[PDB]
Amino acid sequence: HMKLSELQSHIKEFDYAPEQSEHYFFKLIEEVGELSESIRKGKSGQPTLDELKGSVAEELYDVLYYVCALANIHGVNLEKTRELKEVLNKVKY
Amino acid sequence: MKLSELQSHIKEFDYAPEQSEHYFFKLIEEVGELSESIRKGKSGQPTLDELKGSVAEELYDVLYYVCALANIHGVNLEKTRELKEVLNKVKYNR
Amino acid sequence: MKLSELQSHIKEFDYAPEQSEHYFFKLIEEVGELSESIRKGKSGQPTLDELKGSVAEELYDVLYYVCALANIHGVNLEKTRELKEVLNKVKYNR
Amino acid sequence: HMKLSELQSHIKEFDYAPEQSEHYFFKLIEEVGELSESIRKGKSGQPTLDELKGSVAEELYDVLYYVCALANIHGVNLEKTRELKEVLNKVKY
Ligand SMILES: [Mg+2]
Ligand SMILES: [Mg+2]
Ligand SMILES: [Mg+2]
Ligand SMILES: [Mg+2]
Numbered sequence A, D: 001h002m003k004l005s006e007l008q009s010h011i012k013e014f015d016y017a018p019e020q021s022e023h024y025f026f027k028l029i030e031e032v033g034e035l036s037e038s039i040r041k042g043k044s045g046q047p048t049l050d051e052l053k054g055s056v057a058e059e060l061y062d063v064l065y066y067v068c069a070l071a072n073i074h075g076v077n078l079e080k081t082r083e084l085k086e087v088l089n090k091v092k093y
Numbered sequence B, C: 001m002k003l004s005e006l007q008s009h010i011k012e013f014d015y016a017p018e019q020s021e022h023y024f025f026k027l028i029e030e031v032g033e034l035s036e037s038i039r040k041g042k043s044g045q046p047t048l049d050e051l052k053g054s055v056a057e058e059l060y061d062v063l064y065y066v067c068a069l070a071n072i073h074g075v076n077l078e079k080t081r082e083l084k085e086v087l088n089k090v091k092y093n094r
Helices: A004-014 A018-040 A056-073 A078-090 B003-013 B017-039 B055-072 B077-092 C003-013 C017-039 C055-072 C077-092 D004-014 D018-040 D056-073 D078-090
Strands: none
Touching: A004 A056, A004 A078, A004 B003, A018 A056, A018 B017, A018 C017, A018 D018, A056 A078, A056 B055, A056 B077, A078 B055, B003 B055, B003 B077, B017 B055, B017 D018, B055 B077, C003 C055, C003 C077, C003 D004, C017 C055, C017 D018, C055 C077, C055 D056, C055 D078, C077 D056, D004 D056, D004 D078, D018 D056, D056 D078
16 A cells, blocks of 8 residues: 555656646646535545546545645655644644 | 555544535635645745644645545545556556 | 626526535636636637636636625625725725 | 626726736635635624624635636636626527
């Protein structure tokens, strides 16, 4: 099972255009829109390959893709961000 | 950090299946906060004192709600990731 | 086109107060379509054949759901616009 | 009561930076996020001046503001767009 840092870095291999940061933010919003549709239509559950198009699962995945792509573009390590949040959570507490 | 364990760990303390709209509202809220952080140029890997309101934090918060929504809608993100890579490959592989 | 009449005219054919989440989903859908139209640079005032998928059309569609949500949530956009201009003025006027 | 073209053009008078188109799109998303919060918290109805902050009304208004601001930035006449949509609707039909 893939690590989040591995997903980020695979994405960075084939989809990383630092001169076009805005692209990735536009894409995030597009996928959030597609997600909204898929939830509106109740396309829940875990699809098979054939059921994947337009499913909530696919759209959640596409949002995730752009979260990772934006992290690459903006010099963010998500796993390291989590650790720092843990530090803050522990003082809270 | 792995996708299934992350989803699952969040599910342990934040799972209210009777409140599915809540998770969608929250996603949109974090995406707006993300938008603000990008607009303000709060990029890079923040130190502890820079964390709050950083692009980094807001990306995490969006990720959090992606995982929380996946739990709510019966979705396994890891399985879905695998199917998405299979579909791409079947589309284009010789 | 005036804000109250626009809201009201939409209310005539599209008002389902039992389906308030519907209008919020639709807003987010149109905002995503707007995002695509801006990304693709489909700006300017389109002719009839350019209308579908133009930044112009998607801005209208977002506006539509803003008005539809206002109806749903008991909001008068015109009155609200007036109060917002009053508030700005009370904030800064000498 | 103000026309939509008057709202667009008032906004254009005090908030129009064509070299910063992206700003307006970021702002639209910010206000959509604030809107989401205000609906989540059920802050419906028509506020008075004192109740305006954080209300659904204010947030819907702020989204509208950015719809008009984006229309200015992207050379869009909303009223003219409506007329053209009417033409298309009438063929539909
Ligand atoms: Mg998609
Ligand atoms: Mg946040
Ligand atoms: Mg549309
Ligand atoms: Mg606001």
